[PDB]
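G., before I forget:
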Amino acid sequence: RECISIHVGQAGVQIGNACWELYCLEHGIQPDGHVPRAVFVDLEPTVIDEVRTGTYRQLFHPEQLITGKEDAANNYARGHYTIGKEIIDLVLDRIRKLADQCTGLQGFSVFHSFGGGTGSGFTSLLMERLSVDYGKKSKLEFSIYPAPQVSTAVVEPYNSILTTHTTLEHSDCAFMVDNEAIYDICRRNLDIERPTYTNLNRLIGQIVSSITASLRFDGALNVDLTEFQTNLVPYPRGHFPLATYAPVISAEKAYHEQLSVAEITNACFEPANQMVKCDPRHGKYMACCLLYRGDVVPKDVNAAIATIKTKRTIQFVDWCPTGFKVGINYEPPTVVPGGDLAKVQRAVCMLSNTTAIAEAWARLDHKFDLMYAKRAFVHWYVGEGMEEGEFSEAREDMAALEKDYEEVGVDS
Amino acid sequence: REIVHIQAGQCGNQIGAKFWEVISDEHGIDPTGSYHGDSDLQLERINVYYNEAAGNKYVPRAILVDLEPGTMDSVRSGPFGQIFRPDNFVFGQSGAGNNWAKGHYTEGAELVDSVLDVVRKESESCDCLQGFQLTHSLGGGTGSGMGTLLISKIREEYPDRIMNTFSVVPSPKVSDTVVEPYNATLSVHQLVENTDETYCIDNEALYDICFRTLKLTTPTYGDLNHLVSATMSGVTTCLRFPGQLNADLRKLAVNMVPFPRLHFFMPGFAPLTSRGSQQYRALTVPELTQQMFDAKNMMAACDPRHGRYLTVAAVFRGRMSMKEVDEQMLNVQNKNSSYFVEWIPNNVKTAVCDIPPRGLKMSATFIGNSTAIQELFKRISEQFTAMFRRKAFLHWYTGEGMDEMEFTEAESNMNDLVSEYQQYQD
Amino acid sequence: SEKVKVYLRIRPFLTSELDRQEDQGCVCIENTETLVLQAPQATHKFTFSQIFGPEVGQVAFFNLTMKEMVKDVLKGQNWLIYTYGVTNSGKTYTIQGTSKDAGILPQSLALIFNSLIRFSVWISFFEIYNELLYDLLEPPSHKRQTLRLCEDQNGNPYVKDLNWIHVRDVEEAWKLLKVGRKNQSFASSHSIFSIRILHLPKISELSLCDLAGSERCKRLKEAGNINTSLHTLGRCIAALRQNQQNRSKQNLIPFRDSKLTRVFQGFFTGRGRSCMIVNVNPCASTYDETLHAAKFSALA
Ligand SMILES: CC(=O)O[C@H]1C(=O)[C@@]2(C)[C@H]([C@H](OC(=O)c3ccccc3)[C@]3(O)C[C@H](OC(=O)[C@H](O)[C@@H](NC(=O)c4ccccc4)c4ccccc4)C(C)=C1C3(C)C)[C@]1(OC(C)=O)CO[C@@H]1C[C@@H]2O
Ligand SMILES: Nc1nc2c(ncn2[C@@H]2O[C@H](COP(=O)(O)OP(=O)(O)OP(=O)(O)O)[C@@H](O)[C@H]2O)c(=O)[nH]1
Ligand SMILES: Nc1ncnc2c1ncn2[C@@H]1O[C@H](COP(=O)(O)OP(=O)(O)NP(=O)(O)O)[C@@H](O)[C@H]1O
Ligand SMILES: Nc1nc2c(ncn2[C@@H]2O[C@H](COP(=O)(O)OP(=O)(O)O)[C@@H](O)[C@H]2O)c(=O)[nH]1
Ligand SMILES: [Mg+2]
C-alpha cells in the first residue's frame, strides 16, 4: 500500500523537499501537522541542513535526515567505495525501520541525479542492497538526466554511466527527466527567462504528485505501482520512461484554462512538451501510461486514445498491438499558490518508454568514451578504490543497452 | 570541512597577514573580538579556519613559519597580528638566508620538527579536516625551502587530505631575487611531487592589473597582496557557505586536475574595477565572463591565448540565474573553442554561492588550468640553466648540503611536466 | 626494442579444491607460448611467450623463465622479474616456493651463485608496505626509514641509503631471505629482492617482485593508494607497448603518477630487461580478477 521515498544527493534533497512541499500542499497539511515516508541522504552536510533550517523544518524527523560531515565531491567512486560504505549501513537501517513501520509496503520511490557524486555512487550501492533485501518489492527510481549540452560537471558522463550500469540490474523502472528539457518547457511554454533550479523542481514534483500521490488515492481507475512496471517494462531491464505533463500553461500570459480532454492528451505527444530531450526522432512507443487526474470522462479518454492510435505519426513497436495504460484519478491537479502554473481542473500525465532513449544514451555514451580515451580524471576514481574493470566492463555493459533498444525497437 | 592555513617565508607571512586582514571582514571577526558580522550565516562556517576557544576570542588556525624574526614580528605588531596564538608562531632565529638548501637541509629541518608538532596539533582539533592551505615564495629561503619540506611531511602524514598551495612565482621581467631561478626550480620540484592544487601569482601581473583595470598609481605590496587575499577567499570561504550549486576542494580538484601531475591553475577576479570612476556597476553576467576570461586580467604572466584551457572552474558568489551563468559559459566555450580543448565536452565546472563578498553585489572567482602556464615553466627553466651552466651561485647551496645531481634532478622533473603539458596541449 | 617477455602460469588442482568443488580449469594450455581461454562461456586467446601448466613443478617455472635471466646477469645487463596475477593464484608460491621445489627467486640464487676471476655479489631484500620501504635484512618488524630515489646525470634512478651486504655462497643470500620472511609484515608488504653481481667491471642488478594481494571481501587508505599504483602500472605498460611497437610514437609515460612506477622506472624503461609473470586462478568465482589481468595482458 505505502511507499517509502529515498532522496540521495544534493539535487535529490532539493527536488525531494520541493516535491514534498507540493505533496503536503494538496494534502492540506501545514508545516507543523503527519509523518512523511521519506528520507534525505547526502554526504554534503550543507544540503541536508537546508531542510533543517528552511521550509518544513519540523515536518521531517532527524532520523529521516542522514548527514555526512566529510566531503562528497562529484565522483562516483567516492560515494561508492571511499566514503560511500561509511554511511550506507546507517541509511539502510533507517529505511528498514520505516519499511517495518508500514504494514504491507509496495516499494520504494528513489530520487537522485545521474550527474553528481552522492546522486551517483550512493544510489548505486543503495539499490544494490535493496534488490537483495527487498527483491519482492517494487523499485521505482526517479533519475534526473544531465543536460545534453549544458552539463553541470566535467565528469558528468563518468558518474552517470556507472550509476545506470549497476542500477540497470536493480531498479524495476526508472523515470528519467531531462534537466535541459525543463528549461525548454519554461522557455517555450511557461514563457520565462528566469527558470531557477527551484522552479524546475516545481515541474518535476508536479509529475510525482500525479504518479504516486493522487494515484494512491481512490479514483475511477487506479494504477498500482506494481502495475506500472508490469505495463511499462516488457523486459527485465531497468528501462527509462519519459515523464510528460499536459498542463504547462503559465498563470499570467496565456489564459485558455478550459481545455478539452482531446487537447490535453494531444499535448503529451509533442517534443516541445515532454520534459526530456529524447525528441521523437525515430523512437517507437512500446508502453505508454496515461494518468488523468481531475474532471475527465472515461469515454473522452477512450476516444482521445483511439484517435491518437490511428494517427500513424506516433509509431508503436511492431510487437505492440496495444500499449496504452489508462489511469483515472478523481483528485484534480493542485497548483502552488505562488508558482507559475495556471491551475487546471484536469491534468494528463504521460509516462512512456520509447526507442528515443537510445539516442539520448548514445550522446552520453560518446561523452564517456571521449574522455575515457585518455582516461581523463580517472585517478580521482581509481585512487578511491576503483579499478579499470569498474570502467571498461561498465563501458561494455552500458553499450549493450544501445543494442537493447536497437533490437527491442526498429525491427519489425 | 575545516582547513588549516600555513604561511611559509617572508612572502607567505606578508600575504598571510593580508589574507587574515580580508577574511576577517568576510567572517565578521575583530582582531580579538567576537562575531561582529553583519549577517549570521557566516557564523555557521567559522569552524573552517577558526578554533573554538574562549567563545569571544576566535583563534585562526594558521601556522606561520619564518626564519626572519623581524619579519614575523612586524606582523605581530601590526593590525591583525595579535589575533594569532603564540603557539602557532614558529620562528627560526637561525641563518635566515635566501637559499633553498639552507632553509631546507641546514636551518630548515631543525625547525621542521617544531612545525610538525604544531601542524599535527592543528589537524587533530575537532570534526574532520579537509586539507592544508599554504602560502609561500618561489625565490626565497623560507618560502621555497622550508615550505617545500612542510608540504612533503604533511602529504606523508595525511595522504587522505588535499593540499592547496598559493605561490608567487619569480617575476620574469624584473626578478626580485638574484638566486631566484635557483630556488624556483627546487621549490617547484617538491610542489608537483607533493601538493594537489597550486595557484600561481605573478609580481608584475598584479602590477599590470592594478594599473590598467584598477587605477592605482602606487600599487605597493599591501595593495597587491590584498588582491591575492581576495581570490583565495573565493576558493576557500566562498566554497564553505551554501548556494545554488555548491563546490569545494574535492569538487574542484576532481574537475580541474586531469592527471597526477598537480597542474598549476591561474587565478582571476570578476568584480575588478576602480572606486568611483569605474563605478558602472556593470556586473550582470556577460561582463563577468568578459572579465574572468580576459588575457590581461589573469594574476599570472602567462596569458590564456598562449595555450588552451584544460579545465576551468567558475566560482560565482551572489544571487543570480543559474541558467544565465551556464548559458554564458556555453557562449564562451563556443566562441573560444579553438583554445578550449577538443578532448573534453565541457571544460567548465560551474558553481554558484548564495552569498556575495559583503560590500559587493555580484562576484566570481576565476580558476583556470590552461597549458598557457607552460610558457612560465620554460621561462623559469631557461633562467635556471643559464646560471646553472656556470654554477655561479652553486657554492651557496653546496656549503649547506646540496647534491649536484639534486639540482639537475629538480630541473628534469620540471621539464618532464613541460613535456607532458604539451601532449595534452595538442 | 626488446619486448617484456610474457609468461602465464595457472595454479594446480589439489585434493582440497577438488573436494570443495569442481574448480574446472577455465584456462587451457594451448602450445608453450599461447593459451586458449574458455571461462564458464567466454572465449579469449593469450599470446604471452611462455606458459606452463599446473603439472610442472616450482623448479620448472624457474628452469625456463628464470634461466634466461641467469644468462643475462653474466651478460652484464640488469633484469627485473615481477610476479603479477589475481589474488591467491600462487604467485608467492611461484616466486618463493618451498625447500624441495624452490621458486624462481631462491632457484635464481642457486643458479646465479653457482655460475659465479673474482666475482662479487651484493644482496638487498626489503618490503614496501603502504608505499614505505622497510629493510628486511637489518630490522626486526613493524618507524620511518630515511631513503629516497635520486636521479643521476645518467638519468638512471638510484635509491639512496640502501643496505648492502656481501655474500659468499647462495645459502647466505637464502638465509637473508629467511630473515626477511620472518621480519616481513603483510597487507590487509611488497617484497623485492635485489641481487647485484659484479663481473670481474660489469655489474648486473636483478630484482624480484611479488605482489601481495589485498582484495576486499564484502591501515589508512591502503586499498585506494595501491589501487592507484596498479592503475598507473597498467597505463605505463600500455604506453610501453605502443612506444616499443616503433611505427613512430613518442608518448609521455605517467611514471611520475605513483611512487611504485617511479621507483621501477629504471627496470622497465631504463637499463634493464624485465619479464612479466602472470599467475592466474582457474576458479570461476575468481574470474572477476582474472578478467582484468587477462585484458591487461592479452589484447582483446
Ligand atoms: C563603496 C564601494 O562599493 O566600494 C567598493 C569599490 O569601490 C571596489 C572598486 C573594490 C575595492 O577594492 C580595491 O580597491 C582593491 C584594493 C587592493 C587590491 C584589490 C582591490 C574596495 O577597496 C574593496 C571592497 O571589497 C569588499 O568589501 C569585498 O568583501 C572584498 N573585501 C576585501 O578585499 C577586504 C578589503 C579590506 C579589508 C577586508 C577585506 C572581498 C572580495 C573577495 C573575497 C572576500 C572579500 C569593495 C566592494 C569596495 C572597496 C571598499 C572600495 C574592488 O575590489 C574588490 C576586491 O571588491 C576593486 O574593483 C572592485 C570593485 C568594487 O566596486
Ligand atoms: N533541476 C535542477 N537541477 C539541479 C539542481 N541542483 C543541481 N542540479 C543539476 O544537477 C547536477 C549537479 O549535481 P551536484 O550538485 O554537482 O552534485 P550532487 O549530485 O548533489 O552530489 P555531489 O557531487 O557529491 O555534490 C548538475 O547537472 C546541475 O545542473 C536543482 O536544484 N534543480
Ligand atoms: N603450484 C602450487 N602447488 C601447491 N600449492 C600451491 C601452488 N601454487 C600455490 N599454492 C598454494 O596456494 C596458496 C596461494 O599461495 P601464494 O600464497 O602462493 O598466493 P599469492 O601469493 O597467489 N597470494 P596473495 O599474495 O595473497 O595475493 C598457498 O597456500 C600456496 O601454498
Ligand atoms: N605579492 C608579494 N610578493 C612578495 C611579498 N614579499 C616578498 N614577495 C616576493 O617574494 C620573492 C622574495 O622571496 P622572499 O619572500 O623574501 O623569501 P623568504 O622570505 O627568504 O622566504 C620576490 O619575488 C618578491 O616579489 C609580498 O608581501 N607580496
Ligand atoms: Mg552536493
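The pocket of magnesium ion (ligand 5) is lined by residues A 10, 44, 47, 72, 118; B 246 (CB under 6 Å). The first strand of chain A starts at residue 3 and ends at 8.

More on Monday.
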